[PDB]
Amino acid sequence: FFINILTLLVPILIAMAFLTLVERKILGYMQLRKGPNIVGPYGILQPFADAMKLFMKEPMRPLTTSMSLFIIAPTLSLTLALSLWVPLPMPHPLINLNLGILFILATSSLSVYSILWSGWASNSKYSLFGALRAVAQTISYEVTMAIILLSVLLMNGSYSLQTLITTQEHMWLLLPAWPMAMMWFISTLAETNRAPFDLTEGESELVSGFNVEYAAGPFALFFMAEYTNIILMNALTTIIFLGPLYYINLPELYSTNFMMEALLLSSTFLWIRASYPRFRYDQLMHLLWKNFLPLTLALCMWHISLPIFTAGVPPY
Amino acid sequence: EGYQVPPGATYTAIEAPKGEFGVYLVSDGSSRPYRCKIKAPGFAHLAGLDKMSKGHMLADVVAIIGTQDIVFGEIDR
Amino acid sequence: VKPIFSRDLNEAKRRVRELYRAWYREVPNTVHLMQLDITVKQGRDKVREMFMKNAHVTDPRVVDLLVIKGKMELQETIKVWKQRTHVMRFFHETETPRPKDFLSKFYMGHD
Amino acid sequence: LTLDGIKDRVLYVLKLYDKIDPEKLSVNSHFMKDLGLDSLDQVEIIMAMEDEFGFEIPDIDAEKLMCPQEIVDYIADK
Amino acid sequence: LLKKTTGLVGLAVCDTPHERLTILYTKTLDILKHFPKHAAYRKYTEQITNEKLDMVKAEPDVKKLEALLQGGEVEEVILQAEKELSLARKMLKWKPWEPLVEEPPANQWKWPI
Amino acid sequence: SATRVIQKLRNWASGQDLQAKLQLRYQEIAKRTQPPPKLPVGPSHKLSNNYYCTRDGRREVVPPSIIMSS
Amino acid sequence: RAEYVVTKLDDLINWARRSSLWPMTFGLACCAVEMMHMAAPRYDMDRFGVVFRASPRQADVMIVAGTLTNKMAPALRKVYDQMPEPRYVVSMGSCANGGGYYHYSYSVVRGCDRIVPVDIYVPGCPPTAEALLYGILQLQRKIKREQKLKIWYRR
Amino acid sequence: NLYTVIFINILLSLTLILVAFWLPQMNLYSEKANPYECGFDPTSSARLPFSMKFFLVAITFLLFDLEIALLLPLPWAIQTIKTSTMMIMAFILVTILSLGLAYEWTQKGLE
Amino acid sequence: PTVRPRSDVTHKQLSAFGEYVAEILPKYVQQVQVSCLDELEICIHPDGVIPTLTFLRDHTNAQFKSLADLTAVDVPTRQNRFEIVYNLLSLRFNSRIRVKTYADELTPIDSIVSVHIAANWYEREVWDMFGVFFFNHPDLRRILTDYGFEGHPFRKDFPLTGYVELRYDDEVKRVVAEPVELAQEFRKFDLNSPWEAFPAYRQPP
Amino acid sequence: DMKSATDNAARILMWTELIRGLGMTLSYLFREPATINYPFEKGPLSPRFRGEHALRRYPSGEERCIACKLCEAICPAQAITIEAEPRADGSRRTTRYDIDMTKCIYCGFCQEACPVDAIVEGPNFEFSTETHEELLYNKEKLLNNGDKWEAEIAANIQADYLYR
């Protein structure tokens, strides 16, 4: 078990730093630059040097802060994002939780709490604006997050995340739910806090939002939890709305199908990050609550309608 | 020494792509200017930003300083 | 000559008394709120000696322009456009004073 | 209320004031004549009286104020 | 038909431009009746408003009113003529037609000095 | 200097001829080792009629005319 | 002989700081458009691994571009003090060098060396983005060649 | 298993916090640890009453959170004998959940 | 080709407009100068600057709605040393006008906020740089000088290099002020040639 | 019509104009990047590039700076102090030259003022230093700067002197 949690947790941190590496490289390729290829063999050494350098960067204990809550926020954010990864289905999950997608939804609702704890306990007006817009991003994302995670999972009929693997062996899940996939994508941009719907760590809005007072290793923990949440909910959109091929004798073909589909989905996540202009929280609350909340409730109505329209109800 | 410049005042407002740019040179008859005001285009724009930013929020005001295109060397002089 | 506010000296002196009352009212808020490295008593003595620095003028338009310059200092002191660096360069904590006797001015420089 | 206690409090505030000597303190002592006070130190001592008591005294009232018996008789009648 | 877009923003279009222009030109003619005849602002303002009001009662078309007013658009000359009306009342309050209140020193307007 | 499959991929993404008009200068730069260009003289490099008092632009100005008052 | 181990760990602990240096999204200048020209994809920041982070707490080095005036001086130094103690100063521009233009003016601080400790001086009112790429490379090798664990070991 | 992954995850995050703290040098001062508002003395305390304007949208989030909590047992509710009963009544429930937002959108509650 | 060509039709029609404004405002207009550069320089009296600019903005035949520029030029020979300009510019007539009044540093000029809100910042800039009181301004707060900068800098009696100069110390850890002594003296050049430059602009003795 | 209604109702609710913008960003990640590895690949400059100031020389010894005191009357930095003496040779050179690289606006006025083209602005940018003293170029640093870059300057002056 300990060898399994080492080979799950240490390669996901190395792959998260290498995701930051290929994020900056494909982001700079979008912005017509070659990217950080000098310091590594084709640049395979730069966010490892960032995670090294932010250790002996000086941390900050300000006058105005409360230091216990100020230091208990990023350690809970790292524990949060690295223990959100364990009810992921994969071929076979490490935690075979019976209703684990509600734990995913609950700890992603916990993911928009450590940012508010940080933005209060930093004791800056800038961090307080970032904390209030993190509350506004909760107000935006959370009910449409739960309704998209409810209504298309009513077609699977169970909150066990293992039962979605057997559902979509021959066909994908974006073919029965194409508006639900793109509305899940634009709500998971709000939970992930990436540059379409990033409104609480922005250099043009505030001075980087909620990371005003956070230097060094705690800022490395917040960046760690940030990019762990990026690859995490890329894997969530991968594991719900697209269906890879399952052979029960060969899970490795399923894992490399997961690899190519998750690499194109993380490529379109950082492509949709680096393309668009960045929102304002008035029209974020306006387009979600006025436009995309009754569309989620109406496709939720149509997902009430479908198992009595045909075929019976799904299995337990 | 430079140019011995005849005295008098001129001000030549040309189209800067921020707006009005024109310099109010006065000459003493020597080769030095006596004074000039350099017309910043955005000086009156950022004077009038208080009118146009009412009833909005902070992302709208950073959108309006990006719209109005204020760089500050000509304005602070 | 055209006046500014005051047709005499004592009405401008009353305006000077009003500005001194508002400055004495304002300065413990800009000791406590400014996180300043002084007490309130030598700050009030600094306000009093800055009033006594321009005490020699009996001209009403000059002291009315001193009233608007003290009002702009009051406007930048009630609100915190001035900071802890700008607000107490008046104390001269770093600059040594120029000596007033003849012998030290003889030793220092050609003045 | 406390018509002698307000005189005790004005002796308290001119005892807590520093420029006026307490042996030279009197109930009929002139401020600008024999206490070494200029035209803003009267404003200083009645503004210390103002923050000690709470009721407002204007600067129009300050130049007519000379000795505080008439202002404590003005404020003692409620 | 009346224009939906006014050619501007904030200066809203009006439905009766002939009526507002005749009514406010008679109002700014009536304001200058309390001006003195010795004041030559009364003569030149009465000349320009009488000639422009003669153009208004000459032409009934709105674009021909714009072309013979020569002030851009009809809402712009409505706005500027109401500023002229407020100017005529304010210069009744100020009375500038009397002569110069103070001669300058003789070195004040000499360049170079 | 891209290949035809990725060139047709970005032509599918655009609809424009990026291969014909790239944003990066390949060989459209003129050669930086140049012949020395003899600059022409102006209109008043003439030895005859070279009088400065006819062409004198800095003495033809007048001090400004006070038209009406004082 | 642990001095070789100390110097190799010092080079390994300075390799991360010389590679992944994070500057500050600064301004204050005519010269500050050339910070955006290093950001521009001809003479690139991010190829060497240089990321414009707005916060001082995220920043590792302040690129002071240009005009340092008297109103901006406590706003400069209150930002620079709150930058945490791995901190270097590049001074882009002759106004950040010595008060290049506006030297004998009334409200310009006469260089940024008057206020902050400046580790490297970049000349130019255009400093070329090649020239501040040289400044980033030379500050990079300066904090490479500093020896903190070596002077800790012979202490 | 979930307890030991939460325990070893918070222990690795705690030793990341400890190797953030005790590995560099320790030297602080008051100008360093002053709070950040682009480098200025505090005009006001940050802990002050903020009169933000998304308050009715925030309470509508709380009621919609409660509504999706009663919506949440639906994959077990679809496995029942009274399918038409849960169908008609759940249609009524999410219809009035949409109708509350329809009244808020009519009466400008989301601005 | 060297000399700029001269179009005198604009000179005579703007001179007719200058005679027009000099006749219609005889109380305030002290003179009107017309240069050779087809622009007008109406020099007025500072007690009535607001009838002059409300007449120049609101009238249908002047129509200078947009204010452009506002400073002084400080000539210390005159008894009223500041020479306050108002450069205004018509959008509709495609023309320009200059209004020049005077100022002492004790005699105020009543402000022009009520006619143009363009001068909400220009008059504050003038109060920094030269130092004239502006009557009934909303706020005449200092803008371009330092917070606590004693001295209006654009006058001729203020020096080039100033009086204070900032410097960080580690005694107090603030950006403190010192009286300036220079690292290098600004070398004052005698750029005035001693020979007579323009015979048209000759000063009589 | 109804077709414009389907076009607008497919622009909204599919966000296909945002898919259009996504593809327009997608087209440039398959392009060649325009960066250069700076200490190995250096970018385009010109022979008129006013860079580091440098004092040239005549082609047979003999320092070209003839002490005119006109290049500080044109210098807007007031950076140049060129207090000279005779050389006790009958010639006319400088004993005190100072530019200030920290002042020094890099404006090209002194390279166009100079009647013999003694000071030039040689095309350099690799002179960013670490202390303030090393950007205070007096006379010998300027002379061996021009001696260092004399083969680089003179071909640019030979290709550039028809323009000036």
Ligand code: SF4
């Ligand atoms: S050195 Fe020159 S361009 Fe650079 S900041 Fe100063 S004035 Fe602006």
Ligand code: SF4
């Ligand atoms: S550098 Fe040129 S202009 Fe200057 S003194 Fe020397 S020779 Fe003369």
Ligand code: SF4
């Ligand atoms: S390049 Fe310009 S600023 Fe530098 S020394 Fe030459 S003239 Fe002076």
